[PDB]
């Protein structure tokens, strides 16, 4: 029974008449656009860092795999046999303060 929460509340539709004003200035908009440019460049650099890291660690994994192939095949069998420990994969993100 899928009950999504995308519906706009009729209470808000009635009492949505309190702050209808939006005012911006020339210098504020210029700083908005320039900071958008710098942030776009920064996220591009961070994405390129992510790409370099993933290709580096994929390269390390594939060279590990090919060295394992040239030394032994049954280790490849048991290694490509994936573990059932991944089935209840339940982990939690970082916090703000230690306990």
């Amino acid at each position: 029974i899928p009950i999504e929460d995308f519906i706009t509340p009729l209470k808000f539709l009635d009492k949505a008449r309190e702050r209808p004003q939006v005012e911006l200035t020339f210098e504020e908009t210029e700083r908005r656009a320039l900071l958008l440019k710098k942030w776009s460049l920064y996220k591009q650099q961070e994405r390129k860092m992510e790409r370099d890291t993933i290709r580096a660690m994929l390269e390390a994994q594939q060279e590990a795999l090919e060295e394992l192939q040239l030394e032994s095949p049954k280790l490849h069998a048991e290694a490509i046999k994936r573990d059932p420990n991944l089935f209840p994969f339940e982990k939690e993100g970082p916090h703000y303060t230690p306990p």
């Binding site: 808000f12 539709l13 949505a16 916090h95 703000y96 303060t97 230690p98 306990p99």
Partner: protein, 45 residues
């Protein structure tokens, strides 16, 4: 690299103010939650 998912804007058009309240579970840690009636400390028993 958690700041990408921790930094976002609300894409919808009709919503209330977002208050950075600090939820404290009994584990002894704080977390930034969006809750109305902005109590700064929000403790769980």
């Amino acid at each position: 690299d958690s700041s990408r998912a921790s930094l976002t804007r609300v894409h919808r058009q009709a919503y209330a103010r977002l208050y950075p309240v600090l939820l404290v579970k009994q584990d002894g840690s704080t977390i930034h939650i969006r809750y109305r009636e902005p109590r700064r400390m929000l403790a769980m028993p």
